[PDB]
Amino acid sequence: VVPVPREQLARSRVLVVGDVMLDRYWFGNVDRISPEAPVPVVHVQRQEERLGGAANVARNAVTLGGQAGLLCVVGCDEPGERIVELLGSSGVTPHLERDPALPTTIKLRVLARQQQLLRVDFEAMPTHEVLLAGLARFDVLLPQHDVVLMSDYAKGGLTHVTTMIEKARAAGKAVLVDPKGDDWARYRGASLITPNRAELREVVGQWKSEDDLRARVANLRAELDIDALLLTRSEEGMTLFSAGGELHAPALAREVFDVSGAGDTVIATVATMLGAGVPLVDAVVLANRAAGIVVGKLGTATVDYDEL
Ligand X SMILES: O=P(O)(O)OC[C@@H](O)[C@H]1O[C@@H](O)[C@@H](O)[C@@H](O)[C@@H]1O
Ligand Y SMILES: COc1cccc(OC)c1-c1cnnc(NCc2nc3cc(OCC(=O)O)ccc3s2)n1
Q: Say how many residues touch ligand Y, by CB under 6 A.
A: 20
Question: What, of its own copies, ligand Y, ligand X, none, does residue 23 touch, CB below 5 to 8 Å by kind?
Answer: ligand X
Question: What, of K ion, ligand Y, its own copies, none, does residue 297 touch, CB below 5 to 8 Å by kind?
Answer: K ion
Q: How far apart are the first and last CA of the chain?
A: 10
CB-based contacts of 47: which residues, under 8 Å, 6+ apart? Answer: 24, 25, 26, 27
Question: What, of its own copies, ligand X, K ion, none, does residue 110 touch, CB below 5 to 8 Å by kind?
Answer: its own copies
Could you list the residues that contact ligand X (CB under 6 A)?
21, 23, 35, 52-53, 56, 107, 153, 260-261, 263-264, 300
**Which residue number, 34 or 144, has a Cβ lying nearer to ligand Y?**
34
Q: How far is the CB of 298 from ligand X (least distance, A)?
A: 13
Length of the chain in terms of residues written? 308
CB-based contacts of 298: which residues, under 8 Å, 6+ apart? Answer: 257, 258
CA angle 114, 308, 3 (to 5 degrees): 170
CB-based contacts of 7: which residues, under 8 Å, 6+ apart? Answer: none
State the CB neighbour count (10 A cutoff) for residue 26. Answer: 18
- Beta bridge partner(s), residue 16: 70, 149
Q: Identify whether 152 is a catalytic site residue.
A: no
Does residue number 289 form part of the binding site for its own copies (CB under 8 A)? Answer: no
Rounded to whole angstroms, the Cα distance separating 229 from 239 reads 8
Does residue number 295 form part of the binding site for Cl ion (CB under 5 A)? Answer: no
Q: Which stretch binds its own copies (CB under 8 A): 12-20, 120-128, 226-234, 245-253?
A: 120-128
Please give the C-alpha separations between residue 269 and each of 60, 250, 273, 283, 299, in angstroms, as whole numbers.
Answer: 7, 17, 6, 7, 18
Does residue number 256 form part of the binding site for ligand Y (CB under 6 A)? Answer: yes
Which residue in the list 264, 282, 304, 306 is annotated as catalytic? 264
Question: What, of Cl ion, ligand X, its own copies, none, does residue 301 touch, CB below 5 to 8 Å by kind?
Answer: none
Does residue number 82 form part of the binding site for its own copies (CB under 8 A)? Answer: no
Q: Which stretch binds ligand Y (CB under 6 A): 8-16, 181-189, 248-256, 276-284?
A: 248-256
Rounded to whole angstroms, the Cα distance separating 38 from 53 reads 34
Q: How far is the CB of 218 from its own copies (least distance, A)?
A: 30
Footprint on residues 26-55 left by its own copies (CB under 8 A): 26, 28, 34, 36-37, 39-44
Contact 51, 83 (CB under 8 A): yes
**Which residue number, 68 or 238, has a Cβ lying nearer to ligand Y?**
238
Q: Which stretch binds K ion (CB under 5 A): 113-121, 139-147, 218-226, 257-265?
A: 257-265
What burial letters (b/e) apply to 102-127, b meaning 16+ CB within 10 Å? bbbbbbbbbbbeeeeeeeeebbeebb
Contact 102, 19 (CB under 8 A): no
Q: How far is the CB of 296 from ligand Y (least distance, A)?
A: 8
Please give the C-alpha separations between residue 50 and each of 65, 152, 161, 213, in angstroms, as whole numbers.
Answer: 20, 18, 26, 36
Q: How far is the CB of 268 from K ion (least distance, A)?
A: 13
**Binding stretches for ligand Y (CB under 6 A):** 196, 198, 232-235, 237-238, 251-253, 256, 259, 262-263, 266, 288, 291-292, 295
**Binding stretches for its own copies (CB under 8 A):** 26, 28, 34, 36-37, 39-44, 78, 109-110, 115-123, 258-260
